[PDB]
Amino acid sequence: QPNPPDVDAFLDSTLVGDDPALAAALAASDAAELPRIAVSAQQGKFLCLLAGAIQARRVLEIGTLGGFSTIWLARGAGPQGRVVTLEYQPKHAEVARVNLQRAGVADRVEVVVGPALDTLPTLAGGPFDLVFIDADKENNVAYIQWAIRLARRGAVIVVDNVIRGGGILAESDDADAVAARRTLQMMGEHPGLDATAIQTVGRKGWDGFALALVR
Amino acid sequence: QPNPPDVDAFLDSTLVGDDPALAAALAASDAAELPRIAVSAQQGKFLCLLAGAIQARRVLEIGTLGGFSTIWLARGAGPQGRVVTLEYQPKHAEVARVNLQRAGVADRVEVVVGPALDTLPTLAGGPFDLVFIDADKENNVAYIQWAIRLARRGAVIVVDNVIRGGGILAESDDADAVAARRTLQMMGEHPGLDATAIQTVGRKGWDGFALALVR
């Protein structure tokens, strides 16, 4: 009987528990018709613990998607940390701001509105410790080149949804699956990166994330 | 129909490539009838990148299992890093030492032979930055308590195989599934830890790992 969504409900109850600020962010994102949140609670808390493990003080997020991922990163970056998150749609940006205010981390977060390919070149404040990429996968090759350019040596880059239910193997038909396949090929062959990819299951289905160190 | 083992062969080719030292460690472990290695190449490289990301200098591994996991950790800890790895069986310990010598990391690794509950109290190679636990699940609660005791604040603990194909949900037959369920509930209620669990698929099947920060 047991399937990965059922295991994730057990893991959420056991390791995350009641988190009204996250519940409210997911509800508000549904009401405003954002795209689906990219990370499960377990995957989001992974990003939180990764940020804490490396003592991330400056985090770049490409794809705010309602700020569920952003809340986790801002919690992990801690009282002194700062997250810069890039959102395309101003309405989506406003949803994220309210979700961040309700979670008590709006002071750690700057939401930067506009197409990421136009706003990435305009970022200052200095190099990032951690870059998280989870929207607009057609532009992943450009986002990864920008991530490398904006990140310190030894920084972590995480790219969400690089597996697409195994579509990356046999689906030339699907632009989405092709774009995920292309981001893996780019991360593997880039001499500025050392990269792995973890296939995941749970409440977000069969997918996975790439994780790289900047050399 | 793409499946996770097929996706992992593509991920291994793209992100890991030919690694004769690792191939030889897996072959020698099979010949000497060790238990199955706990981590895939992608999961092993994850441990490598995690060690590099946190700048691990002192790594504790509980369950050498032929030293596949250990080679990844020793590569990630770098030339200045030290790995202490605990193996129960002397024959298994000898396989691991040869695999470590062939991978050129023997000087970074001390294999400590005996029951982990007898050797853990004797370790002075800490405090540890990173603890990896992948053997003898029935003793996981004790291993995690020892991990916390021997680890610095902010240290990472990773516990392999905490999902068991979903067996942790209706597990009565299986000592392993029972033990995995107990390790999740212990990690979730421990005030000295913050913990998540990532469900994985790929060449090692449907399982997962817990990742915790030591508070």
Residue numbers in the entry:
A (entry chain B), B (entry chain A): 6 to 220
Quote the study that presented this structure, word for word.
Mycobacterium tuberculosis (MTB) H37Rv is predicted to encode three COMTs, i.e., Rv1220, Rv1703, and Rv0187, which share 29 to 36% amino acid sequence identity. Here, we present two crystal structures of Rv0187 from MTB H37Rv with and without cofactors at 1.64 and 2.08 Å resolution, respectively. The protein adopts the Rossmann fold typical for numerous SAM-dependent methyltransferases, containing seven core β-sheets surrounded by eight α-helices (α1α2α3β1α4β2α5β3α6β4α7β5α8β6β7). In both ligand-free and cofactor-bound structures, Rv0187 appears to form a canonical dimer observed for all known COMT structures, consistent with the results of our SEC experiments.
